[PDB]
Amino acid sequence: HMEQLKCCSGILKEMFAKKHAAYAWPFYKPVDVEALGLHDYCDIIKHPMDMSTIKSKLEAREYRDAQEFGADVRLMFSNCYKYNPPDHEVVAMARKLQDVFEMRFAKM
Numbered sequence: 001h002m003e004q005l006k007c008c009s010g011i012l013k014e015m016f017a018k019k020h021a022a023y024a025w026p027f028y029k030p031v032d033v034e035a036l037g038l039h040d041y042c043d044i045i046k047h048p049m050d051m052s053t054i055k056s057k058l059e060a061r062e063y064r065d066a067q068e069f070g071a072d073v074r075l076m077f078s079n080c081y082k083y084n085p086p087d088h089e090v091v092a093m094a095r096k097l098q099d100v101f102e103m104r105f106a107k108m
């Protein structure tokens, strides 16, 4: 439905909000694969995903429903959990943002 997708746009807007910015910012745009320490990112992560790409996909009607949108949000988090050591600060930030997402996605 149009309504399901409108709710998805609302979840993504909250993920971009000032309230969550302290932990959401690494997910706003594609990972900078030219940064020092990120030389192997593309060899490990086959399908990079970020919040701006998801926003563009919603705008271009690339999701048929909420499950397709949710799969891209979860892909973004799973890339973070796969690539980094489990004790990395970015993994803790991904979990805080995933808490926001899962609670809204469950209640939509």
Ligand SMILES: CNc1cc(=O)n(C)nc1-c1ccccc1
Binding pocket: 026, 027, 031, 032, 035, 037, 038, 079, 080, 083, 084, 090
């Ligand atoms: C190890 N660095 C990262 C791992 C990761 O999973 N995400 C999402 N971002 C980063 C990152 C953050 C700032 C600058 C460059 C990369």
